[PDB]
Design a protein around this nucleic acid. Structure first.
Length: 164
RNA sequence: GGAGAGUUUGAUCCUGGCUCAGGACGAACGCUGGCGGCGUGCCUAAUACAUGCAAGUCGAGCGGACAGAUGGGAGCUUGCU
């Protein structure tokens, strides 16, 4: 479903890109923005930020962030299993680990996983070093996650039978 | 038990290069330098070497030399032979 706006969003920015456009006179410098937005309890999202200024792009990032959020399973403050997302030439894989392992991730990706609350991820940016698509490389993989009690309900099977 | 970042462009994504942060040296150089353990210390020339030492041991394997004086005796200077 759609995640409601009845939460506590923390919304720290990642990068700012100044982005041009060439008219009869000369250039026109605007700014681009993207802000990873969420709580620390499993809801992550973002939106684009476009303006003619610095701070109003920060404002309009929050709108589509509250229009588009997504939820992640938090089994033991980890991802419950291993997955590899492949959206648009930026491959970023996701590996779970033990609870002491911290958050080892790429630059913009590290400002995503701490905005999940999930603190145990190994990852490695296989694909390109572009900030929009690396975040698209994360949530697309995080969308394809599964829960332990859910797939047993999908299989019509016991949850403990998935473990033993 | 797996971090990435600058760069082609007016601007964007890819693509693709190199660059960079890290870790080691039997390392050298520049500048400085108080000490203590533990460890290494000719990779090039297996090129040439002054000087000293680096493999001898058994007299219970053996002949002889080699000193020896336990005493014995000799010639006298009492110093010796």
């Amino acid at each position: 479903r759609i995640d409601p706006s009845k939460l506590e969003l923390e919304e720290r920015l990642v990068t700012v890109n100044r982005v041009a456009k060439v008219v009869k006179g000369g250039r026109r410098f605007r700014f681009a923005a993207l802000v990873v937005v969420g709580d620390k309890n499993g809801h992550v999202g973002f939106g684009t930020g476009k303006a003619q200024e610095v701070p109003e792009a920060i404002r309009k990032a929050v709108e589509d962030a509250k229009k588009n959020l997504i939820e992640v399973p938090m089994v033991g403050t980890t991802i419950p299993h291993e997955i590899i997302g492949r959206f648009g030439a930026g491959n970023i894989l996701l590996k779970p680990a033990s609870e002491g392992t911290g958050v080892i991730a790429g630059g913009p990706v590290r400002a995503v996983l701490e905005l999940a609350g999930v603190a145990d991820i190994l990852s490695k940016s296989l694909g390109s070093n572009t900030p929009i698509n690396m975040i698209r490389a994360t949530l697309q993989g995080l969308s394809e996650l599964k829960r332990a009690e859910d797939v047993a309900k999908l299989r019509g099977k016991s949850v403990e039978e998935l473990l033993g």
